Structure formats: C-alpha cells, structure tokens
Design a protein around this ligand. Structure first.
Ligand SMILES: Nc1ncnc2c1ncn2[C@@H]1O[C@H](COP(=O)(O)OP(=O)(O)OP(O)(O)=S)[C@@H](O)[C@H]1O
Ligand SMILES: Nc1ncnc2c1ncn2[C@@H]1O[C@H](COP(=O)(O)OP(=O)(O)OP(O)(O)=S)[C@@H](O)[C@H]1O
Ligand SMILES: [Mg+2]
Ligand SMILES: [Mg+2]
Lengths: 419, 419
C-alpha cells in the first residue's frame, strides 16, 4: 500500500474509493485534497502504509518530501521529515526517500516519517558514505550516446541527422539554439524517444519551464522517463523551485554512479525566472538583466560533467533566439561559450517546411575524437567537407534525400563513399 | 602535519583518516569542511601544526591566507591573519607565508598563525627589505626563452613553428589572437610543457577564466607548474579576485629576482568580468562596455617587464575574435598596441585540419634583435621573405612539410639554405 498508485490514477479512482470507503462528498476539490481525504480515511482504519518521494530541506531543517508524479506542487500530500531524521540519516535535498509513513497527531496535518527503508534506491546505511557531486573530478565525454533508433521508421530520420550533425555522449553539455517555430519540441520528443529506445539503462528526465499545458500533456503521455513541467500560470518562484529540485535530484542520482540525462526547455525561460526572482544587486547589464541574476542558471548548466569515479550527468538545454527581445539575445550571448555541443536550428529552413531544420555548418561538437571511433570520424569529416560549400537549405535537402535513399548511417556512408 | 599536505590528498582519503580519528559521518559534506574537521581534531591532540599559502588583505586589514591547490577559494580552512603581525612584518597582498598556525578560540572560526617561519621562501628579516615592483625600471626582452623541446616528439613541430613565428623572451607582453575552435588551449598547453622542460628554473603560472571544468581538470593534470582556474559557474567577483591574487603573487615573486610566467586564457573573459563587476561611470562604449572597466585588465597586462635589478615577469594572454559579440572586438582593438608579441591563429587553416593553425605572415615579434643572434635572425628573415607571397594555408602546409623531414631548427635552416 503506497501513495503512488493512489496518485497517478484518474477520477475513476476518486469515484471508486468514494463508493467503497464511504466518504461524504468528493469530486469538489483538487487531487491533493482528494488524496488527503483518502489517506486520512485509510489511516483511520489503522492498516500499515508507506510512502516515497524526493526529500527537500527548508531554511531551518523543516524537512519536506515532495512527489514527482504531482510535478512537485506544494500541497497537503507533502510528507513531513523531522530534523532529527535529517541529522540521523544525513540526508540533503534531492534524496529519493521511501519507507514507513505515520498518520499525524493533533496539532499537525502532515504525515511524518516512521522509518526509511530505501534511500536513493539503495540501503540507507550505504547512502551516507557517498562522495559529493562537487568533490568529483570532471572529465570529457568518453562513451558515445548514439541516437539512431534503428527501427527503420520515418521519424528516426531526424535522429539519424543528429548522429551526423553533432555527436552526443555521456556527460555532454549541449545547447539547441533555435528561433520560434523551428521544431524544438519535436526535436526534444525524438531525442527522448532515442534515449528511451537505445539506452534504457540511463535515467531520462525532462524539465519544462513556462510551457503551455497542452504541450505538457503531450510531453508526459509520450516519453518513457518521468517528466516534470511547470506552466506559465505558476509564478517564477515555482520555476526556480522546480529547477532546483530537478538539479539536486540529478546530482543525488549521479552520486551513485548513475547516468542522468536532463532535457531543458528552455534555459532562456529559467534565466528569466531567476532574473525576476533574485533581488537586484545594483548592477544591471544590457537588456535589463542583473549581473548576479545569471549566476544561478549557469550553475544549473554547469553541473554537466563526466565523473571519473562513475556515472555522468548530461544536460541538453534549448535556447531561444530571434524572439524580438534583447534580453533573450543577452542571455544567449552570456551562455554562448559555456556548452561543449551546439545544435543550431534556422527558421529559413523551417519556412520551407523541411524538417528537421538544422543549420548543419553552424551546429557541431568539440573534440568528438574521445567520443567516436576514427574511421567514421573521417567519414563525417569528408561528409562535412563536401556539404560545406552549398547553402544550408540545399544542404538539408541533399542530406534528407540521401538519407531517405539509404537505410542506416553505415549504409549512408557506404553509398556516399562508393558514389 | 601540513594543511597543504591534507589539501593535496584526494577526496576519498577523508574516510581513511576520519574513521580512524573520530569522525562518524564525514563523507557527506564539502571537502574543505572535512579538512577543517580533521585539522580541528588534530589540534585537539596538541601537536604543533604547520601552515602555508598566499596572503590576502581585505578592506580593513582583516587578513586571510588561501591555498593554491584550492584555487584561492574562500573556505573554512583559510588561515586568519590579524593586522598586528601585518603591521609588524609589513606584509602585503600576494606574500607567500609559511609557519606555525593556531587552533581557533571561542568566537573565532578561522585558524590564526602563531609565528611565521618563512616569507616568500626567504627569511622574514631578509624579505623585509625588498624593492617595489612599481619602482623597478622596465626594459625590453633580453634573455631568449627558447620553446624548441628538442626531443623530436610528435607535437614538437608546434613548438618549432612557434619559435620560427614569434620569438619569446623573458619579461615579454604577448597576445594570442584566435577565433573559436582554433587550438588556443593546447597551444598554451604545449607552451607550458616547453617552459617546464627547457626552463625548470622560472616559475610557471597558468590562469584560466570561466573555463569549463573538464578543461580545468585536463590543465591541472597536464602542466607541471601550479595552475589556477575559476569556472564559469562562479560569479565575476570570483574571477576578479583570482586574477588579482595571481598578479599580486607574481609581483611578489618577481620582487625577489625570480622569473615568473603567466599564461592567461583569456584576457577577453577577464575584461568581461571586470566590465560586469565595476560600477558604471556614465560613459559606455560601443557594445555595452564601460570605459574605465578596461582600466583594471590593462594593468594586469601592464605588469610584463624586464627589470634592471633582476627577475622577469612574462605574460602570454589570449584574446578571442570572430565570436559575434561586439564587446569582444571592442576589447580587441582596445588591446592591439599594448602587446609587444603577436601570435595570430586563423580559422581557415583550422578548417583544413592543418595544425598548429598559425597566421605566420600576420604574427611576429617587435624588437627581436635584442633576443636573438644575427645569423639565425638573418635565416628567419630569409624564411619570411620566401614565405610572404603565398597564402596562410599554403604557408603552414609548406612549413609543416619542410619541418617534418628535418630534426631541429638549425637542421631546417641548413636544409632550406642548401636549396
Ligand atoms: N520532424 C518533424 N516532422 C514533421 N513535422 C515537423 C518535424 N519537426 C517539426 N515539425 C513541424 O514544425 C512545426 C512546429 O513544431 P514545434 O516543435 O511544435 O515548434 P516549436 O519548435 O516547439 O516552436 P514553438 O513551440 O511553436 S515557439 C509543426 O508544424 C510540426 O509539424
Ligand atoms: N596540434 C594539433 N594536433 C592535432 N589536433 C589539433 C592540434 N591543434 C588543434 N587540434 C584540434 O583542433 C581542435 C582545437 O581544440 P581546442 O584547443 O580545445 O580549441 P580551443 O582553442 O580551446 O577553442 P575552444 O576552447 O574549443 S572555443 C581540437 O579538435 C583538436 O583536436
Ligand atoms: Mg514548443
Ligand atoms: Mg579551450
């Protein structure tokens, strides 16, 4: 009996539990309050129950535990975590905590934590003796993270283009630069699909900032890995809170020699949120951004590394350009040289409805020698040499035609070399 | 026992000492906190405790002492320095201080020092009577700093091309102008390796600004001399204080008739940090960059000189062009006339995968007569007059082809003269 199976289910669970456990009148309140009523009525019986979620530390040890199913909304379903347990188990923000849960006594309205039985999907005894993320020596991307799905579909074409445009490996740090209406959302969809198909072992999690609710629903009903999204309805303070929770959870996961992958849409929106939430430092840059305001997002982008001890943390965040706002241009300029992978999308190609609309010459990755082999390295080199002269629209038309003629990337290289 | 000895040890050993010395949960916190805890527990035992590092003076004499291996980061393990011994010893910023340290008392969190045993690797009385860096009369470069490794390595052609392109001497002010994806980082790496090998006597310092952590790790693991870097995650004040500490330490070392070399990557990033940290003065140049904001970086570049009394301070700083940000080239034409050694890297040569990509015709050195003998100067003049007409890509291809079949620079000279 866990809190998860009573959260993800729809209002059919509401009506069934109302007609079964005999609650007075449900279906007039948020899912958090419905779940609160169900848990209160079930704890009234006294049957043993347990919970799970992601730990969070407030400014004074007021331990909270959020749920990733509900996108980390602060509601009644949040689980109390006492400071005594915090200093006993030595837990910090982002820890995945599951264990026995306690009904509340008089004076409080939150379930506390009876005892833990799983910390970060591991024994709590072994979780304490773990090296910090900040104390891990970074390296370059070693293991190639292939995106070719290999099922011979038609959407996979764009994924194939990725394997020809910019190589992506474990621990990379990439920026997808694109104007509005250029295919960012479907590119992220295809990247998530490729990660779920080719690399089921690595943890995939997608963060969405101030996106429309319809796009959130489309994202959450297609990707395999869990997805967290905050709409533009919520204030930017919640955007910052969600981003901090995501990055802390990723750090905690990668501290256990796990491969974490984060997809962010968008870094510009997160920078906006940080700019409009952080108090002014008295120094305002061009475009209306505070000098310290951009310090926080960079750290979020700075966590991408390839730990030598074990595991890696890859971050692929998209950036908005040509949006008519000078502040977006300032943010992109400040983030221009940070990433080690660049994927440039052009509205000129997308105008002709040729997808994916990737500026092949501008897009690329740095020191990909450590990622891929050498023979296909010069294959891609000669491909780049022959595709360099003609224009980007013609380049993409030629690329998609030649890729559709063949079946796989290796077959594509075979045909290109033999012809 | 040495605080620096503990700092140089890796992260993991915190367990090996801690479980043997009284710490029950020492894994989960920042490394400097472990160092603080262990050295507190050692001061509890009562044996004498050493300390050393670079001194720093605050706005009110509230002095601190940082460590090089920590990249001059303000941490709990920093050594407190009261104004009393500052006044008695006449210490100044950038001093190298070594000696006793004292456990903190009630109301103090930092470790004070009992008495100094060595100042600037010299007796405090002898180091007391030293001349200011400002009062030292500058000169031109006299002692040639040859970069030819001479072991016939697989990369020694880069150093050979460097010697044939721009002669480097002691106390020389150099600029490396290159676009992105040109080869700045490991060109500087080869420079540092050649300095460490050919000239072990001179102190080698490498300074990196807002660089990616992987590059920082590679630089730390590759160069023999000490290297300091601040990643782009850190704010601009961190960059400014790191650069100030480095330049002050270099001045203090060269005040003792020592040769110091500073490799800077990059002066553009340091100028950007100074621009975004210095308060506005009401005069904004093109590209949204203040006027006096460039005052501080030039002083950092203005310390390269050759001294009558002794010692030398060479600075090789790289600059970025063809980036797309207006302030970058604004800084570039705000730095052309300052440097007396120029090294241009071109994108076109790098696009042909021919390395090192050095624009030989545009690069050069002024007042090279005082650095080199007349015979090899005439040989280089003959090479320059036979290399001028053909283009940079062809020039570098020809230079690499001719240098590959020879062994040393002199052999190349006779090979071209006999033809
Ligand atoms: N691989 C693709 N195959 C077919 N159509 C595509 C593909 N990628 C993008 N499109 C089309 O491109 C258009 C825009 O797609 P989106 O990814 O939703 O745009 P966007 O990048 O999210 O930019 P916004 O959200 O409108 S600011 C739609 O008409 C899609 O059908
Ligand atoms: N002498 C050389 N031999 C072989 N490859 C080289 C040589 N010099 C440069 N390269 C290659 O050219 C690229 C230069 O890499 P970097 O030195 O890291 O570039 P950079 O000058 O640091 O500019 P950034 O930091 O990437 S914007 C890499 O792909 C290297 O493999
Ligand atoms: Mg979209
Ligand atoms: Mg570099």
């Amino acid at each position: 009996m866990n809190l998860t199976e009573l959260k993800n289910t729809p209002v059919s669970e509401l009506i069934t539990l109302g007609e079964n456990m005999g609650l007075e009148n449900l279906a007039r309140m948020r899912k958090q309050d419905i779940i609160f009523a169900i848990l209160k009525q079930h704890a009234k019986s006294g049957e043993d129950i347990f919970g799970d979620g992601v730990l969070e530390i407030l400014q004074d040890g007021f331990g909270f535990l959020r749920s990733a199913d509900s996108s980390y909304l602060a509601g009644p379903d949040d689980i109390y975590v006492s400071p005594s347990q915090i200093r006993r188990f030595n837990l910090r923000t982002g820890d995945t905590i599951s264990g026995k849960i306690r009904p509340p006594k008089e004076g409080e309205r939150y379930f506390a934590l009876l005892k833990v039985n799983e910390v970060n999907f591991d024994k709590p005894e072994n979780a304490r003796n773990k090296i910090l993320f900040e104390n891990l020596t970074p390296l370059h991307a070693n293991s190639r993270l292939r995106m070719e799905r290999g099922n011979g579909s038609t959407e996979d074409l764009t994924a194939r283009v990725l394997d020809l445009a910019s190589l992506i490996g474990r621990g990379q740090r990439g920026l997808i630069v694109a104007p509005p209406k250029a295919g960012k959302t479907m590119l992220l969809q295809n990247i998530a699909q490729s990660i779920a198909y080719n690399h089921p072992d690595c943890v995939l999690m997608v963060l969405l900032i101030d996106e429309r609710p319809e796009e959130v629903t489309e994202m959450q009903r297609l990707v395999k890995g869990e997805v967290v999204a905050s709409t533009f309805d919520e204030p930017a303070s919640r955007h910052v809170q969600v981003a901090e929770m995501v990055i802390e959870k990723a750090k905690r996961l990668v501290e256990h020699k796990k491969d974490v992958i984060i997809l962010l849409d968008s870094i510009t929106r997160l920078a906006r949120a940080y700019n409009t939430v952080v108090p002014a430092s008295g120094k305002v840059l061009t475009g209306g951004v505070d000098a310290n305001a951009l310090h926080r997002p960079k750290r979020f982008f700075g966590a991408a590394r390839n730990v030598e001890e074990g595991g890696s943390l890859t971050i692929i965040a998209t950036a908005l350009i040509d949006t008519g706002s000078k502040m977006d241009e300032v943010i992109y300029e400040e983030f221009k040289g940070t990433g080690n992978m660049e994927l440039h999308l052009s509205r000129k190609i997308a105008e002709k409805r040729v997808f994916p609309a990737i500026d092949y010459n501008r897009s690329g990755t740095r020191k990909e020698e450590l990622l891929t082999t050498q023979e296909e390295l010069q294959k891609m080199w000669i491909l780049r040499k022959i595709i360099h002269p003609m224009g980007e629209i013609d380049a993409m038309e030629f690329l998609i035609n030649k890729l559709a003629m063949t079946k796989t990337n290796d077959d594509f290289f075979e045909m290109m070399k033999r012809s």
